[PDB]
Amino acid sequence: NYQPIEHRGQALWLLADKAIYWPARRALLVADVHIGKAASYGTTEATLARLDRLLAEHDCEQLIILGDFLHARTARAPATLAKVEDWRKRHKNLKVVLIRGNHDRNAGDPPASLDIQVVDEPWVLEPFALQHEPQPHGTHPVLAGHVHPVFVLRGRLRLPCFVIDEQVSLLPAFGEFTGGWEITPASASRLYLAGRVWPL
Ligand SMILES: [Mn+2]
Numbered sequence: 049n050y051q052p053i054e055h056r057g058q059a060l061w062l063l064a065d066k067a068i069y070w071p072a073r074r075a076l077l078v079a080d081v082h083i084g085k086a087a088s089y090g091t092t093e094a095t096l097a098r099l100d101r102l103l104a105e106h107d108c109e110q111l112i113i114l115g116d117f118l119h120a121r122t123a124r125a126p127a128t129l130a131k132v133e134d135w136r137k138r139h140k141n142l143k144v145v146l147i148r149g150n151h152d153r154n155a156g157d158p159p160a161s162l163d164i165q166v167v168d169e170p171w172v173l174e175p176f177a178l179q180h181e182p183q184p185h186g187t188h189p190v191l192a193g194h195v196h197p198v199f200v201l202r203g204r205l206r207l208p209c210f211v212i213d214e215q216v217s218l219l220p221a222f223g224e225f226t227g228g229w230e231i232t233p234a235s236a237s238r239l240y241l242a243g244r245v246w247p248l
């Protein structure tokens with residue numbers, strides 16, 4: 049279930065499971081998936097199956113990963129890439145665009161058999177500069193990943209949050225990890241807690 053917002057003249061749906069759906073572009077946006085950052089006690093399969101649920105829920109002609117799809121060199125692993133191959137060939141017609149992050153650079157471009165269009169930040173889909181790193185763009189509003197934004201609630205709970213802002217907006221990390229960059233409670237931006245999508 050989703051929270052619609054207007055942002056720079058576009059209707060964007062913030063998804064409870066840490067994704068943005070862009071209806072006019074029939075596009076699903078996520079960031080910091082970190083396939084291969086799984087521990088052994090959160091799984092690669094669970095992450096891919098989590099994508100399959102969003103892709104079945106919404107008309108997605110394309111998926112755009114704002115950086116950090118595969119974790120590292122131990123994510124170019126025999127078993128692990130096999131599961132991604134499995135997943136990709138179940139969505140043969142989906143276009144998958146990866147904007148390269150510091151982990152995509154480190155590991156290297158995903159193998160060509162997986163049919164992933166690798167591009168360099170910024171990748172501009174008007175009105176938006178899509179980026180991994182949240183650097184301001186010279187002319188466009190930015191949608192970015194990289195920082196793994198969370199918001200701290202006390203009674204502490206680190207919840208993943210969207211940061212919707214005029215110049216640089218942040219998507220929450222799609223991977224399921226501890227930590228995250230604590231977003232200041234005094235920010236002059238719109239915050240949505242991606243457990244519903246909870247505004248502030
Ligand atoms: Mn990351």
Ligand SMILES: [Mn+2]
Binds near residue numbers: 150151
């Ligand atoms: Mn990063």
